[PDB]
Amino acid sequence: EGPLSVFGDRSTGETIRSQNVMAAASIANIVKSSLGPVGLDKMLVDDIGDVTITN
């Protein structure tokens, strides 16, 4: 970096844009398999052992 002593991290330009898009895509890819009368369900387990079944 050099200038702008910020004690943080800065990202600028297409890079961040692409990153943002990817994040959104990931979320969709989690639920894309639970849409319509044919899609199936999901099982979620926490750290202690509770099970939640849902779509």
Partner: protein, 55 residues
């Protein structure tokens, strides 16, 4: 430029919302109980109570 994309998206959304009001069906024109039952059964599909939609 992103501003052009934003303006195009806004225009498309407004026109789509305006046009959807031509695909409408008045449920009193249909038999009310049948329309309600069909709406509920359509909502219930893809769930654990799918095949039992009528009950």
């Amino acid at each position: 430029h992103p501003t052009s994309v934003i303006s195009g998206y806004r225009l498309a959304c407004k026109e789509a919302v305006r046009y959807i009001n031509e695909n409408l069906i008045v449920n009193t024109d249909e038999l009310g109980r049948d329309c309600l039952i069909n709406a509920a059964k359509t909502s219930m599909s893809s769930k654990i109570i799918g095949i039992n939609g009528d009950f």
